[PDB]
Design a binder for this molecule. Structure first.
Ligand SMILES: *[C@@H]1O[C@H](CO)[C@@H](O[C@@H]2O[C@H](CO)[C@@H](O[C@H]3O[C@H](CO[C@H]4O[C@H](CO)[C@@H](O)[C@H](O[C@H]5O[C@H](CO)[C@@H](O)[C@H](O)[C@@H]5O)[C@@H]4O)[C@@H](O)[C@H](O[C@H]4O[C@H](CO)[C@@H](O)[C@H](O)[C@@H]4O)[C@@H]3O)[C@H](O)[C@H]2NC(C)=O)[C@H](O)[C@H]1NC(C)=O
Ligand SMILES: *[C@@H]1O[C@H](CO)[C@@H](O[C@@H]2O[C@H](CO)[C@@H](O)[C@H](O)[C@H]2NC(C)=O)[C@H](O)[C@H]1NC(C)=O
Ligand SMILES: *[C@@H]1O[C@H](CO)[C@@H](O[C@@H]2O[C@H](CO)[C@@H](O)[C@H](O)[C@H]2NC(C)=O)[C@H](O)[C@H]1NC(C)=O
Ligand SMILES: *[C@@H]1O[C@H](CO)[C@@H](O[C@@H]2O[C@H](CO)[C@@H](O)[C@H](O)[C@H]2NC(C)=O)[C@H](O)[C@H]1NC(C)=O
Ligand SMILES: *[C@@H]1O[C@H](CO)[C@@H](O)[C@H](O)[C@H]1NC(C)=O
Ligand SMILES: *[C@@H]1O[C@H](CO)[C@@H](O)[C@H](O)[C@H]1NC(C)=O
Ligand SMILES: *[C@@H]1O[C@H](CO)[C@@H](O)[C@H](O)[C@H]1NC(C)=O
Ligand SMILES: *[C@@H]1O[C@H](CO)[C@@H](O)[C@H](O)[C@H]1NC(C)=O
Ligand SMILES: *[C@@H]1O[C@H](CO)[C@@H](O)[C@H](O)[C@H]1NC(C)=O
Ligand SMILES: *[C@@H]1O[C@H](CO)[C@@H](O)[C@H](O)[C@H]1NC(C)=O
Ligand SMILES: *[C@@H]1O[C@H](CO)[C@@H](O)[C@H](O)[C@H]1NC(C)=O
Ligand SMILES: *[C@@H]1O[C@H](CO)[C@@H](O)[C@H](O)[C@H]1NC(C)=O
Ligand SMILES: *[C@@H]1O[C@H](CO)[C@@H](O)[C@H](O)[C@H]1NC(C)=O
Ligand SMILES: *[C@@H]1O[C@H](CO)[C@@H](O)[C@H](O)[C@H]1NC(C)=O
Ligand SMILES: *[C@@H]1O[C@H](CO)[C@@H](O)[C@H](O)[C@H]1NC(C)=O
Ligand SMILES: *[C@@H]1O[C@H](CO)[C@@H](O)[C@H](O)[C@H]1NC(C)=O
Lengths: 427, 149, 248, 99, 179
């Protein structure tokens, strides 16, 4: 049968920006006058965070360039009419493409993924839209943004990335076949299964069962995002780590750092400007130290994110757009092909693989020594004995067939432990 | 008579004289994003996640003749032109929007005043299109094959 | 806490609390005719270091189907002579009378139940000259309560008293400046005619444990009521609960 | 300056009005009557009075007693003038000359 | 980093020369300690930023080594690794702080619209599929063309892959017993 499994790869993260003087001094005139004497401390923090966010924008453009490189489509393509080829339904993977659509929608698998993650790119925007009013009474994001900590949107919207993944999916289905190596989809599936060691007679007899197994694997992926899925937990870990880091940064405004209070309002209503500056200087040093530690941690996390994004670009180029001759790169062995979908802060790859269900115990030979001291070795298969006659079988499906020049590789000599067979002058 | 949270801030109170109860919220605080093109006299302004009624009534009372609401917030000193699309931009505002700069030339001398900043759609990548069929024409497929290189 | 409300949250708070896992001691004594001198000895005469927490049973008697409340009276002082101040907390059937005066205390003090009085007379001080007092105040309590709870402590020359008669957490009752250090407390024996097993099977109970300054984690519900607490240094699970600030 | 997007300094919405609440008709603390009392204690039996739920001001107090010196610690004199407190504790005794 | 030597960090001056010409060694050390702490903090921040940038540099260097091994020294069977597809070969040149790769690729300039078949069903229920190309009809005869250049040529054993059966939507062609 045909098995399918999904894999999430992270390519981005929330873009955090920090107003340094608003985090340290808030409103107060006295705190600001003091902050200036530290010179260029806030400028370096703002510069490092701007460099991090520029790196994020560059990697998003690289992923979008890899998805759209060299794909040619027909201008008569319409996903309301064209969503099915060779009895395989691609409807849950396709967004909305054509000349009469209006590109502002996702596919329903992407709708299933984006409805279980609240703080996506659009969730941050609609959460910050409610800060004038609160919309319950209060929220943690509005308290963070009033102290100068805010998440910015990425430069490309998520519907644009969904349109890119829709173009990459539809490039494998239709008569350009830019993503399916110039052949139709079912023929490409058949040649990839034949490359594993399965004869073409079995694949020609069982095309409808292959299409039904593809439909069943897609439907099993679609009904699998339920509370124990590894990809869903991996997606939610990104949002949870960002929320934890921002909450622990906001908690630094209640440390005293050796002063009499953590509140500038309480200090400035009790002490004189000679005596208040000694207390305010300790709070300033503690808060600048906390901002430096946060900035160093972000600069370290961006390198892991860039490594993951380069791996995702390699899988888009060599598992979805084409199929490399590398074994164990995509999937697990017996890998057939991969499809790609947009995901919150990354990509979701769906890998399809050949899966044996029942077996048979066979006695095999790895080569035969023919008369004249010639040798033959089997090409991705074995030599078997049926009715005391030597035949060939493929290594991944049991189907005895006559030995011919398309099954073997000839050698002018033969190995020392090849089986003797002087009766063979066959086809 | 006082309501606290676990960090030690007062968030509500009961009045001694009238026995009325209130909750307390902080006032608004934020920053503005300025998109600036070189050799221009003023930038274009973006108040993120704010309606323009709030900006004109509660924040700024200087004269701003050009303003509109967008998906990112209130935009001052720019023309709404999101039906137009550009493929390269140096003033990227987020979520697929860009700020373009186009001064009126001597031939296109704009008598009516407007802004030289335009709020447009950023779209950096496209597919190539062909004019072939998507289904079989008599059992055969229609495809484009090169004849020179 | 003093005049604050906390709503649906956990709070880390340091106060004058008992040690979780320690022992209460039931220091109540009931007598009928004779007074043993061993009752007035440093087994029962104890040390007031920082303060005490007490859990007091409200014993209920019935005469002509009418309720009477009764429990033991407590004295806090240093030397219990008329050159020093002693604090006396005594119930009067719904009235809690609290005094701080320079009493001439007896050698063997006791009190007497007023509903069905005993053979002896009430005698804990003799002062026919109205001694000097720093504090004299009456409060009220619920006569139908089952248990009463008290915090008594001292800090920087000031005595503090908290109490509760509905529910377990206590509220501020009073404070009083003394300028001296208190060192001893004593729960006074109560002499009654009828409380024992041949009578209606009632008992006196007065459980006392010491207080110290320590950190707790408290849980406030939707109405602002303390529902759960954990002493942060009592066990390993309590250490995990206080480092996560979570009860689960 | 070059072409770019710049994030400028943070603003705060300016307050429109002022809410001011006080309890009316409270008595006077009368701290000068206790400081100018005829009976003056020694440092061995120094005396304390607590003042709460009352109104005071420092001008009448510092003009009704004969001030030699007035200093403050962990506080400032100009910050007292409009403030409210839970209580004020006043301790007093007479000074021996060589101490 | 050089601009950090003009921050006061809460001291009376950023210059050690001005501090040491005004104050005594008891009073000067309080001012000098603040400058020392500020400058050590600035050096720590710079050192952390350099240690973070070296990891990105090492990732880029490993990618350049992979392209030298598999695009210049040999040509891998990986598609879309070097270049963009239709990639032919690469050359390498030295560059300031790195390498400059020159990629050459096949580029079509003019096109033609052809009707193609992805496979033929021959007599005896046999099948043939084209090897990196298509089957076309010229003068009502089946021929082969390559997929990247239009050049009709006879169907032979070097153009096709044989199958003992044929697919359900292959085009019927019983007249073919050709070369
Ligand atoms: C603040 O507290 C202090 C307690 O620390 C109060 O001071 C107490 O005041 C009591 C008076 O109410 C007083 O009780 C007894 O004092 C009388 C004086 O006794 C002396 O003089 C006697 C002359 O007859 C003499 O016999 C007696 O000697 C006896 O006692 C000594 C031991 O002290 C023995 O060694 C002797 O052998 C002899 O037995 C003393 O020298 C005393 O007379 C009184 O007793 C008579 O009256 C009783 C009642 O009528 C009667 O029962 C008894 O039999 C006698 O007839 C009286 O009981 C305390 O001694 C005294 N304590 C101290 C430490 O000073 C103080 O009053 C209080 N202040 C205020 C304002 O309340
Ligand atoms: C606010 O509520 C308090 C109750 O806490 C009211 O105080 C009561 O006032 C009446 C008559 O003035 C007295 O008989 C009660 O004894 C008071 N109760 C307490 C606990 O002091 C107060 O009047 C209310 N104020 C308003 C404006 O309604
Ligand atoms: C506190 O309550 C007690 C008991 O209700 C009061 O004691 C009574 O006082 C009156 C007047 O002095 C006497 O006639 C009674 O005999 C006393 N009763 C008892 C049982 O002693 C006491 O006066 C109250 N205290 C205050 C300050 O009001
Ligand atoms: C100065 O302080 C003394 C206390 O030492 C006050 O004396 C009190 O006066 C009232 C009424 O005159 C008496 O009821 C008290 O008993 C007195 N106290 C003592 C300890 O005897 C005196 O009134 C104060 N002076 C002024 C002007 O108030
Ligand atoms: C074969 O072609 C017919 C008509 O063109 C189509 O309906 C059918 O789905 C195709 N089957 C396969 C397996 O491609
Ligand atoms: C914002 O507020 C609206 C109405 O007040 C509400 O429907 C919506 O869910 C809120 N969004 C968020 C993210 O809180
Ligand atoms: C416009 O900007 C450029 C910056 O490259 C500058 O050289 C030029 O002088 C400017 N134009 C004017 C009129 O100042
Ligand atoms: C801006 O223009 C677009 C069309 O280009 C329109 O859909 C949108 O509503 C306009 N926005 C406003 C605030 O007028
Ligand atoms: C697609 O994008 C390219 C980018 O250069 C642009 O030249 C082209 O006109 C665009 N085509 C359409 C149909 O938008
Ligand atoms: C090209 O597309 C247009 C659609 O606007 C169509 O009218 C025309 O016939 C097409 N030309 C060819 C040669 O297919
Ligand atoms: C290919 O193009 C070149 C230059 O455009 C021209 O000289 C040559 O004749 C063309 N070849 C064919 C086969 O059209
Ligand atoms: C209980 O506390 C939680 C905070 O953990 C809060 O979100 C919730 O609204 C509270 N419940 C009620 C009924 O207010
Ligand atoms: C109870 O009732 C009896 C007779 O009815 C009476 O003598 C007695 O005094 C009553 N008890 C009390 C405490 O009044
Ligand atoms: C209790 O006091 C009364 C009145 O003074 C008295 O008659 C009675 O005898 C005293 N009881 C005892 C046991 O001394
Ligand atoms: C406290 O008193 C009230 C009435 O005064 C009563 O309803 C309530 O039950 C009492 N509390 C207890 C625990 O009995
Ligand atoms: C008190 O306890 C004794 C146990 O011996 C029992 O016999 C008696 O009935 C009990 N009385 C009441 C009123 O419970």
């Amino acid at each position: 049968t045909i098995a399918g499994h999904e894999e999430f790869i992270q390519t981005s993260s929330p873009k955090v920006t920090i107003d340094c003087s608003a985090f340290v001094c808030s409103n107060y005139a006295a705190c600001h006058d003091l902050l200036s004497e530290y010179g260029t401390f806030c400028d370096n923090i703002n510069s490092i965070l701007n460099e991090v966010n520029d790196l994020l924008d560059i990697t998003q453009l690289q992923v979008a360039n890899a998805l759209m490189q060299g794909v040619t489509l027909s201008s008569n393509l319409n996903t309301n009419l064209h969503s099915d080829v060779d009895n395989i339904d691609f409807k849950s993977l396709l967004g909305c493409l054509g000349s009469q659509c209006g590109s502002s929608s996702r596919s329903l698998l992407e709708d299933l993924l984006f409805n279980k993650v609240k703080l996506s790119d659009v969730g941050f925007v609609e959460a910050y839209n409610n800060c004038t009013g609160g919309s319950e009474i209060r929220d943690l994001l509005c308290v963070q943004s009033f102290n100068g900590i805010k998440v910015l949107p990425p430069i490309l919207s998520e519907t644009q990335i969904s349109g890119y993944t829709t173009a990459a999916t539809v490039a494998a289905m239709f008569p350009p076949w830019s993503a399916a190596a110039g052949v139709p989809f079912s023929l490409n599936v058949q040649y990839r299964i034949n490359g594993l060691g399965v004869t073409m007679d079995v694949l020609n007899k069982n095309q409808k069962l292959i299409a039904n197994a593809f439909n069943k694997a897609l439907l099993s992926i679609q009904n699998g995002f339920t509370a124990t899925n590894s990809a869903l937990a991996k997606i939610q870990s990104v949002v949870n780590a960002n929320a934890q880091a921002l909450n622990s940064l906001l908690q630094q405004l209640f440390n005293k750092f050796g002063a009499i209070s953590s509140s500038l309002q309480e200090i400035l209503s009790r002490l004189d400007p000679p005596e208040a500056q000694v207390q305010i200087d300790r709070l300033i040093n503690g808060r600048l130290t906390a901002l430096n530690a946060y900035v160093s941690q972000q600069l370290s996390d961006i390198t892991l994110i860039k490594a993951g994004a380069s791996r995702a670009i390699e899988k888009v180029n060599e598992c979805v757009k084409s199929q490399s001759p590398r074994i164990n790169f995509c999937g697990n062995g017996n890998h057939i092909l991969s499809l790609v979908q947009n995901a919150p802060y990354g990509l979701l790859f769906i890998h399809f693989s050949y899966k044996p269900t029942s077996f048979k115990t066979v006695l095999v030979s790895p080569g035969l020594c023919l008369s004249g001291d010639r040798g033959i070795a089997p090409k991705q298969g074995y030599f078997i004995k049926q009715n005391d006659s030597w035949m060939f079988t493929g290594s991944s499906y049991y189907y005895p067939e006559p030995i011919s020049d398309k099954n073997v590789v000839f050698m002018n000599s033969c190995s020392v432990n090849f089986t003797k067979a002087p009766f063979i002058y066959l086809n | 008579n006082l309501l606290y949270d676990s960090n030690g801030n007062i968030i509500g109170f009961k009045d001694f004289l009238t026995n009325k109860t209130y909750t307390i919220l902080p006032c608004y605080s934020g920053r503005v994003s300025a998109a600036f093109y070189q050799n221009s006299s003023s930038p274009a302004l973006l108040y993120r996640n704010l309606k323009c009624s709030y900006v004109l009534n509660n924040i700024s009372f200087i004269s701003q003749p050009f303003y509109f609401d967008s998906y990112l917030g209130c935009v001052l000193n720019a023309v709404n032109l999101t039906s137009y699309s550009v493929s390269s931009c140096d003033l990227r505002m987020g979520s697929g929007f860009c700020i373009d700069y186009a001064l009126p030339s001597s031939g296109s001398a704009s008598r009516g005043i407007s802004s030289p900043y335009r709020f447009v759609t950023f779209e950096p990548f496209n597919v190539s299109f062909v004019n072939d069929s998507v289904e079989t024409v008599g059992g055969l497929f229609e495809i484009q094959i090169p004849t020179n290189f | 806490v003093l005049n604050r409300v906390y709503l649906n949250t956990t709070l880390l708070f340091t106060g004058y609390f008992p040690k979780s896992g320690a022992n209460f001691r039931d220091l109540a004594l009931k007598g009928s005719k004779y007074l043993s001198t061993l009752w007035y000895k440093p087994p029962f005469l104890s040390d007031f270091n920082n303060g005490i927490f007490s859990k007091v049973k409200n014993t209920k008697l019935y005469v002509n189907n009418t309720l009477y409340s009764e429990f033991s009276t407590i004295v806090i002082g240093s030397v219990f002579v008329n050159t020093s101040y002693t604090i006396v907390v005594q119930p009067h059937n719904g009235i809690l009378e609290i005094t701080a005066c320079q009493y001439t205390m007896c050698e063997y003090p006791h009190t007497v139940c007023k509903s069905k009085g005993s053979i002896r007379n009430e005698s804990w001080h003799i002062d026919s000259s109205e001694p000097l007092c720093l504090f004299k105040k009456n409060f009220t309590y619920n006569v139908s309560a089952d248990w009463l709870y008290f915090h008594f402590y001292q800090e920087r020359g000031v005595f503090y008293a908290y109490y509760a008669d509905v529910g377990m957490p206590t509220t501020f009752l009073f404070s009083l400046y003394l300028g001296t250090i208190l060192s001893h407390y004593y729960v006074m024996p109560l002499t009654c005619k009828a409380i024992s097993s041949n009578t209606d099977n009632e008992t006196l109970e007065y459980w006392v444990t010491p207080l110290s300054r320590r950190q707790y984690l408290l849980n406030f519900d939707e109405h602002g009521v303390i529902t759960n607490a954990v002493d942060c240094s009592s066990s390993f699970l309590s250490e995990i609960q206080c480092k996560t600030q979570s009860f689960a | 300056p070059n072409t770019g997007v710049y994030d400028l300094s943070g603003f705060t919405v300016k307050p429109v009005a002022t809410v001011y609440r006080r309890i009316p008709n409270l008595p006077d603390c009368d701290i000068d009557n206790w400081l100018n009392n005829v009976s003056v204690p020694s440092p061995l039996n120094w005396e304390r009075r607590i003042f709460s739920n009352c109104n005071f001001n420092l001008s009448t107090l510092l003009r009704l007693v004969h001030v030699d010196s007035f200093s403050c610690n962990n506080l400032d004199k100009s910050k007292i003038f409009g403030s409210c407190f839970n209580s004020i504790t006043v301790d007093k005794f007479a000074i021996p000359n060589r101490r």
